[PDB]
Design a protein around this motif. Structure first.
Motif, PDB file in Angstrom:
ATOM      1  N   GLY A  84      -9.565  16.042  30.039  1.00  7.76           N
ATOM      2  CA  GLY A  84      -8.321  16.638  29.597  1.00  7.76           C
ATOM      3  C   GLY A  84      -7.192  15.633  29.573  1.00  7.76           C
ATOM      4  N   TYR A  85      -5.982  16.110  29.268  1.00  4.09           N
ATOM      5  CA  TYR A  85      -4.809  15.259  29.122  1.00  4.09           C
ATOM      6  C   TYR A  85      -4.591  14.280  30.295  1.00  4.09           C
ATOM      7  CZ  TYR A  85       0.140  14.178  28.532  1.00  4.09           C
ATOM      8  OH  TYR A  85       1.336  13.511  28.479  1.00  4.09           O
ATOM      9  N   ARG A  86      -4.477  13.003  29.958  1.00  3.68           N
ATOM     10  CA  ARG A  86      -4.273  11.908  30.912  1.00  3.68           C
ATOM     11  C   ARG A  86      -5.439  11.569  31.844  1.00  3.68           C
ATOM     12  NH1 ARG A  86       0.988  10.161  30.558  1.00  3.68           N
ATOM     13  NH2 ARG A  86       0.989   8.885  32.459  1.00  3.68           N
ATOM     14  N   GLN A  87      -6.635  12.109  31.587  1.00  5.71           N
ATOM     15  CA  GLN A  87      -7.818  11.762  32.366  1.00  5.71           C
ATOM     16  C   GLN A  87      -8.391  10.519  31.702  1.00  5.71           C
ATOM     17  OE1 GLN A  87      -9.998  15.603  32.693  1.00  5.71           O
ATOM     18  NE2 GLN A  87      -9.610  15.276  34.871  1.00  5.71           N
ATOM     19  N   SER A  88      -8.996   9.637  32.483  1.00  4.92           N
ATOM     20  CA  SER A  88      -9.517   8.394  31.903  1.00  4.92           C
ATOM     21  C   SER A  88     -11.025   8.240  32.047  1.00  4.92           C
ATOM     22  CB  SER A  88      -8.817   7.195  32.552  1.00  4.92           C
ATOM     23  OG  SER A  88      -8.967   7.323  33.953  1.00  4.92           O
ATOM     24  N   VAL A  89     -11.555   7.338  31.232  1.00  3.28           N
ATOM     25  CA  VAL A  89     -12.960   6.961  31.293  1.00  3.28           C
ATOM     26  C   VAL A  89     -12.981   5.456  31.452  1.00  3.28           C
ATOM     27  CG1 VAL A  89     -13.829   8.783  29.875  1.00  3.28           C
ATOM     28  CG2 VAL A  89     -12.956   6.749  28.833  1.00  3.28           C
ATOM     29  N   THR A  90     -13.875   4.967  32.319  1.00  2.00           N
ATOM     30  CA  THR A  90     -13.987   3.538  32.558  1.00  2.00           C
ATOM     31  C   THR A  90     -15.394   3.053  32.205  1.00  2.00           C
ATOM     32  OG1 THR A  90     -12.274   3.610  34.265  1.00  2.00           O
ATOM     33  CG2 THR A  90     -13.784   1.788  34.330  1.00  2.00           C
ATOM     34  N   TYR A  91     -15.463   1.927  31.514  1.00  2.00           N
ATOM     35  CA  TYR A  91     -16.741   1.370  31.097  1.00  2.00           C
ATOM     36  C   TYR A  91     -17.191   0.171  31.931  1.00  2.00           C
ATOM     37  CZ  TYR A  91     -15.934   3.977  26.733  1.00  2.00           C
ATOM     38  OH  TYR A  91     -15.744   5.003  25.809  1.00  2.00           O
ATOM     39  N   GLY A 101     -11.836  -6.859  26.129  1.00  2.00           N
ATOM     40  CA  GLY A 101     -10.950  -5.742  25.855  1.00  2.00           C
ATOM     41  C   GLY A 101     -10.703  -4.895  27.089  1.00  2.00           C
ATOM     42  N   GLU A 102      -9.844  -3.883  26.933  1.00  2.00           N
ATOM     43  CA  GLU A 102      -9.482  -2.950  28.000  1.00  2.00           C
ATOM     44  C   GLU A 102     -10.691  -2.219  28.544  1.00  2.00           C
ATOM     45  OE1 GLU A 102      -4.999  -0.946  27.523  1.00  2.00           O
ATOM     46  OE2 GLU A 102      -6.586  -0.264  28.894  1.00  2.00           O
ATOM     47  N   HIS A 103     -10.832  -2.187  29.860  1.00  2.00           N
ATOM     48  CA  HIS A 103     -11.978  -1.532  30.475  1.00  2.00           C
ATOM     49  C   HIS A 103     -11.935  -0.006  30.465  1.00  2.00           C
ATOM     50  CE1 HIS A 103     -11.744  -5.626  31.563  1.00  2.00           C
ATOM     51  NE2 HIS A 103     -12.707  -5.618  32.472  1.00  2.00           N
ATOM     52  N   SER A 104     -10.751   0.578  30.252  1.00  2.00           N
ATOM     53  CA  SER A 104     -10.649   2.043  30.266  1.00  2.00           C
ATOM     54  C   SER A 104      -9.702   2.568  29.219  1.00  2.00           C
ATOM     55  CB  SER A 104     -10.187   2.557  31.614  1.00  2.00           C
ATOM     56  OG  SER A 104      -8.817   2.505  31.672  1.00  2.00           O
ATOM     57  N   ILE A 105      -9.955   3.804  28.825  1.00  3.46           N
ATOM     58  CA  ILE A 105      -9.130   4.497  27.845  1.00  3.46           C
ATOM     59  C   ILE A 105      -8.831   5.881  28.399  1.00  3.46           C
ATOM     60  CG2 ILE A 105     -10.075   3.231  25.866  1.00  3.46           C
ATOM     61  CD1 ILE A 105     -11.984   5.564  25.344  1.00  3.46           C
ATOM     62  N   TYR A 106      -7.884   6.596  27.794  1.00  4.57           N
ATOM     63  CA  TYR A 106      -7.552   7.893  28.328  1.00  4.57           C
ATOM     64  C   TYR A 106      -7.242   8.906  27.248  1.00  4.57           C
ATOM     65  CZ  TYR A 106      -2.617   6.627  27.628  1.00  4.57           C
ATOM     66  OH  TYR A 106      -1.413   6.224  27.108  1.00  4.57           O
ATOM     67  N   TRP A 116      -8.561  10.041  22.059  1.00  5.38           N
ATOM     68  CA  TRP A 116      -8.617   8.923  23.002  1.00  5.38           C
ATOM     69  C   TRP A 116      -7.519   7.921  22.688  1.00  5.38           C
ATOM     70  CZ3 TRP A 116     -10.811   9.557  27.365  1.00  5.38           C
ATOM     71  CH2 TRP A 116     -11.822  10.535  27.457  1.00  5.38           C
ATOM     72  N   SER A 117      -7.005   7.292  23.736  1.00  3.57           N
ATOM     73  CA  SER A 117      -5.897   6.373  23.623  1.00  3.57           C
ATOM     74  C   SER A 117      -6.106   5.111  22.788  1.00  3.57           C
ATOM     75  CB  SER A 117      -5.428   5.963  25.014  1.00  3.57           C
ATOM     76  OG  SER A 117      -6.476   5.282  25.663  1.00  3.57           O
ATOM     77  N   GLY A 118      -7.364   4.704  22.615  1.00  4.94           N
ATOM     78  CA  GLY A 118      -7.657   3.494  21.867  1.00  4.94           C
ATOM     79  C   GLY A 118      -9.155   3.266  21.838  1.00  4.94           C
ATOM     80  N   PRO A 119      -9.593   2.157  21.264  1.00  5.11           N
ATOM     81  CA  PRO A 119     -11.022   1.895  21.209  1.00  5.11           C
ATOM     82  C   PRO A 119     -11.586   1.416  22.519  1.00  5.11           C
ATOM     83  CG  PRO A 119      -9.825   0.036  20.371  1.00  5.11           C
ATOM     84  CD  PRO A 119      -8.858   1.169  20.442  1.00  5.11           C
ATOM     85  N   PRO A 120     -12.866   1.669  22.721  1.00  2.00           N
ATOM     86  CA  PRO A 120     -13.546   1.230  23.932  1.00  2.00           C
ATOM     87  C   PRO A 120     -13.737  -0.292  23.849  1.00  2.00           C
ATOM     88  CG  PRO A 120     -15.120   2.093  22.395  1.00  2.00           C
ATOM     89  CD  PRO A 120     -13.775   2.374  21.802  1.00  2.00           C
ATOM     90  N   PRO A 121     -14.070  -0.921  25.001  1.00  5.30           N
ATOM     91  CA  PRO A 121     -14.283  -2.373  25.018  1.00  5.30           C
ATOM     92  C   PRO A 121     -15.595  -2.769  24.344  1.00  5.30           C
ATOM     93  CG  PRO A 121     -14.872  -1.390  27.160  1.00  5.30           C
ATOM     94  CD  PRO A 121     -14.132  -0.320  26.346  1.00  5.30           C
TER      95      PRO A 121
END
Length: 125
Positions: A84-91, A101-106, A116-121
Motif C-alpha cells: 500500500g501507500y508508502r510501503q517499500s520493496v527491496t531487491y 541503481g537504487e536498491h528499493s522502490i515504493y 511504483w516510485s521508479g524502476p527496479p535496479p
C-alpha cells in the motif's frame, strides 16, 4: 424533516455543507492511500413516506500497487502479497551479480491508483 446523523467513515471524511435536513447533500472522500468503495454523495430525500439518505454510507479501502517487478538475476527480499501507500520493496542480486541503481522502490498513489516510485535496479554479472 431531517435525515439521521450520517456518522463517520473510517479512513475517510464526510462533508456536510448544508446540514442534514430534507434536501441536503453530503459528500464523501478518503484519506491519502485509500479510495471510496461506494457512492461519492448522498441526498436527504423522502421515499415510501419517510425521510432518509439516498445512498448507503461508503467505506474507504486501501489502494494497492501492482505486484513489484521481478528483475533478472535478482530477488525481492521477503516479498509481500500486497503493498500500500508508502510501503517499500527491496531487491538483492544473486550470487555473482552486482547491483546497479537504487536498491528499493515504493508505492505511490495518484488519482486513486497505486504506482511504483521508479524502476527496479539492474543485477549485472
Amino acid at each position: 424533516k431531517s435525515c439521521p446523523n450520517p456518522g463517520e467513515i473510517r479512513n475517510g471524511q464526510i462533508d456536510v455543507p448544508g446540514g442534514i435536513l430534507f434536501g441536503a447533500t453530503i459528500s464523501f472522500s478518503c484519506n491519502t492511500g485509500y479510495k471510496l468503495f461506494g457512492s461519492t454523495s448522498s441526498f436527504c430525500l423522502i421515499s415510501g413516506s419517510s425521510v432518509q439518505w439516498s445512498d448507503p454510507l461508503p467505506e474507504c479501502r486501501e489502494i494497492y500497487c501492482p505486484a513489484p517487478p521481478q528483475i533478472d538475476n535478482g530477488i525481492i527480499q521477503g516479498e509481500r502479497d500486497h503493498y500500500g501507500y508508502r510501503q517499500s520493496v527491496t531487491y538483492a542480486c544473486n550470487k555473482g551479480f552486482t547491483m546497479i541503481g537504487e536498491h528499493s522502490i515504493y508505492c505511490t498513489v495518484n488519482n486513486d491508483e497505486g504506482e511504483w516510485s521508479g524502476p527496479p535496479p539492474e543485477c549485472r554479472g
